[PDB]
Amino acid sequence: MEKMHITNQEHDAFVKSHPNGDLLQLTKWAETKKLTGWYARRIAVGRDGEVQGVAQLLFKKVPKLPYTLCYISRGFVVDYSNKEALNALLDSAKEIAKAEKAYAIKIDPDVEVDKGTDALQNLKALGFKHKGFKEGLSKDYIQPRMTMITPIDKNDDELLNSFERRNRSKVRLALKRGTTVERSDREGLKTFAELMKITGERDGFLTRDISYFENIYDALHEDGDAELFLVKLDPKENIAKVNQELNELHAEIAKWQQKMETSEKQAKKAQNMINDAQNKIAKNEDLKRDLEALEKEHPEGIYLSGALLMFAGSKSYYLYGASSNEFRDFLPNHHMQYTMMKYAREHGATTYDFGGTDNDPDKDSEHYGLWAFKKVWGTYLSEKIGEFDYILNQPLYQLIEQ
């Protein structure tokens, strides 16, 4: 068929609407990789003025050696059953990659094994070598080969119903206990980085600094493809809520007092309900005091958790999350997750991807916590076909790919 020149926006549109599109094939994602030494090139193929496949190629020089790697991260973006388009994309990639002294062309498209028979067959026939069906988070390939995904093309009740039972209960508590979820801005990243520092120290992880998050956010946020969410506990707002509850409780008492005075038969019940409401009033007043104490410490509230949410068309991604060691009983992360899923659905996404996992690892393994966390959120395990290399220089490939 034919090689085509399409604009950045045209490429991104095609990626966003293709079933095999992905965040890692967007032009603004390539912008984020400049900081770590990657440079980009694009290819497109089609017929009769209609694009049938695209790919964004990232190149990076191999330390100490006169070669590059060509990495098509989550490409090619093509129907892997379209042999003509697939071959044409390989033809174009080989031209560019040889000119860049690449030792191989590495691809890792988001195609589930379930649906990957054609892909495996057709890639094999074209000369690609497979890295194998190893653990979901094997160090033998760059991306996770398994992820955990929540279907979000659901109403609020259906979405909540999809979570595991204990977690549903925690989400309902989170919605009630008194935090708010904010869609933040670039200035919010300073709060986020602080939370991430705390999270790194609590878990065992090395944490990246604010500049690292700014690099991702600034490329994609303009297009609505990156958003930052922050969860706040605001004492003033909650004090207002308590004042309203106190007014409502006094009005309940008024109503039962009026039944007591007019209805002999209901008097014992009325006094009972009055006693209950009086107890609630006393407790609410105690809470008001505690919230006032908090307000003195944190006049404009305190942020408890935060996360970055990315998009590529109908795919949304929970990329990074962080939370502090304080006020954990408000369940801020649970409030955050459900809010972000709803936001993602409203933006046009139908899946919400929590990222990588092993498939049901044992408790002693380094990745167990990821499985324990992600499995309760109405997720299914997405097992991908994996990583494939079209090798251009055999001796170099053997040396490097260790």
Side-chain angles (χ1 to χ4, degrees), residues 1-138 140-200 202-204 207-268 270-295 297-299 301-362 365-382 384-402:
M1 59 174 71
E2 146 182 36
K3 298 187 271 285
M4 298 175 63
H5 169 209
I6 71 181
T7 65
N8 287 12
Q9 289 88 353
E10 290 168 338
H11 176 272
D12 289 341
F14 184 91
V15 175
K16 286 174 167 190
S17 59
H18 194 101
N20 296 331
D22 193 76
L23 176 66
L24 302 199
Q25 290 287 106
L26 299 180
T27 70
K28 297 297 199 58
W29 180 261
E31 293 283 344
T32 78
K33 297 291 182 174
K34 290 175 173 182
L35 191 66
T36 47
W38 301 84
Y39 61 102
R41 291 289 303 279
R42 291 197 284 107
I43 55 178
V45 302
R47 281 186 76 260
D48 308 314
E50 182 181 315
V51 176
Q52 292 186 25
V54 305
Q56 181 167 76
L57 289 52
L58 293 173
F59 292 92
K60 187 172 170 172
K61 173 221 56 142
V62 181
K64 297 157 179 297
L65 283 56
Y67 298 89
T68 56
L69 177 59
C70 180
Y71 179 32
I72 309 184
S73 54
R74 294 280 186 237
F76 315 104
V77 183
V78 70
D79 178 355
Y80 283 79
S81 308
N82 186 336
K83 293 189 178 67
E84 289 277 24
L86 182 61
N87 175 247
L89 289 164
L90 181 56
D91 283 350
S92 297
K94 282 166 61 161
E95 297 197 7
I96 296 175
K98 287 169 173 287
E100 302 299 319
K101 309 297 186 180
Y103 71 82
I105 296 162
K106 178 179 296 298
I107 69 173
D108 53 356
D110 187 4
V111 175
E112 285 177 346
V113 170
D114 193 311
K115 294 145 159 53
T117 297
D118 282 357
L120 289 160
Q121 287 190 1
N122 289 345
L123 292 168
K124 186 182 193 182
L126 290 168
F128 280 92
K129 312 305 172 187
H130 188 225
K131 285 292 192 188
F133 304 100
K134 311 197 170 313
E135 276 278 81
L137 292 165
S138 177
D140 285 16
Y141 25 77
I142 301 176
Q143 301 299 326
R145 193 174 71 81
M146 303 171 188
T147 62
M148 301 283 277
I149 301 186
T150 306
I152 52 159
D153 57 330
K154 286 181 172 172
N155 69 36
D156 292 357
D157 199 66
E158 293 176 293
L159 179 57
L160 183 58
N161 292 340
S162 76
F163 309 156
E164 92 59 61
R165 188 172 188 204
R166 293 201 171 209
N167 193 43
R168 298 198 291 272
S169 164
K170 295 275 202 202
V171 172
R172 291 203 190 83
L173 289 174
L175 294 170
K176 294 153 73 82
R177 299 243 266 217
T179 53
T180 54
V181 183
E182 294 174 356
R183 188 200 92 197
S184 192
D185 60 19
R186 191 183 196 262
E187 196 69 60
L189 293 164
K190 282 182 56 167
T191 297
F192 185 69
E194 291 183 56
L195 293 170
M196 180 66 70
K197 183 174 167 188
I198 296 164
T199 305
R202 178 181 55 255
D203 302 349
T207 56
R208 300 313 315 270
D209 71 309
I210 187 169
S211 293
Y212 173 91
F213 300 113
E214 279 172 339
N215 180 58
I216 56 189
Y217 185 89
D218 289 347
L220 289 141
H221 175 63
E222 204 201 11
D223 303 313
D225 296 326
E227 305 280 346
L228 174 67
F229 290 80
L230 294 178
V231 179
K232 189 170 229 196
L233 169 55
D234 192 68
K236 279 191 191 56
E237 289 193 333
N238 291 20
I239 292 168
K241 177 175 59 147
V242 171
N243 287 336
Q244 171 78 70
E245 286 177 24
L246 290 166
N247 297 335
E248 292 172 348
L249 285 159
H250 280 292
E252 288 171 32
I253 288 169
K255 173 192 74 177
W256 285 108
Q257 277 197 303
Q258 288 304 291
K259 291 264 260 286
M260 199 172 296
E261 291 161 1
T262 63
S263 183
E264 57 306 301
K265 289 184 183 62
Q266 296 205 28
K268 204 179 283 195
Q271 181 61 235
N272 191 241
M273 300 286 124
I274 290 168
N275 291 344
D276 290 349
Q278 289 170 355
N279 292 339
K280 298 182 195 180
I281 283 170
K283 286 180 174 269
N284 273 295
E285 193 82 1
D286 288 340
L287 176 57
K288 184 160 162 182
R289 295 290 87 75
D290 298 342
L291 291 164
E292 284 166 358
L294 187 63
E295 192 183 13
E297 275 290 297
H298 298 102
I302 188 193
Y303 287 109
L304 299 187
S305 66
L308 285 170
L309 180 64
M310 316 309 115
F311 294 88
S314 75
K315 296 176 182 184
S316 68
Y317 312 77
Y318 165 66
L319 231 228
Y320 291 104
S323 59
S324 69
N325 297 131
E326 301 178 71
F327 305 104
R328 300 168 305 185
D329 280 15
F330 278 81
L331 306 159
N333 296 127
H334 297 76
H335 198 185
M336 204 174 60
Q337 288 295 340
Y338 182 59
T339 301
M340 288 187 301
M341 289 175 182
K342 291 183 312 184
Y343 177 91
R345 175 191 66 212
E346 291 311 296
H347 194 67
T350 61
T351 52
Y352 182 96
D353 188 342
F354 281 89
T357 191
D358 290 330
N359 187 359
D360 190 35
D362 289 347
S365 64
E366 53 177 306
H367 311 306
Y368 179 75
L370 298 169
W371 169 256
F373 157 50
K374 297 168 188 199
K375 71 181 203 173
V376 302
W377 285 102
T379 48
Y380 68 90
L381 178 78
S382 182
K384 286 54 153 96
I385 55 167
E387 188 173 288
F388 301 79
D389 296 298
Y390 184 95
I391 297 164
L392 298 167
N393 189 304
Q394 265 295 350
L396 281 157
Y397 179 89
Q398 297 294 318
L399 178 63
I400 298 299
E401 299 256 323
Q402 302 190 239

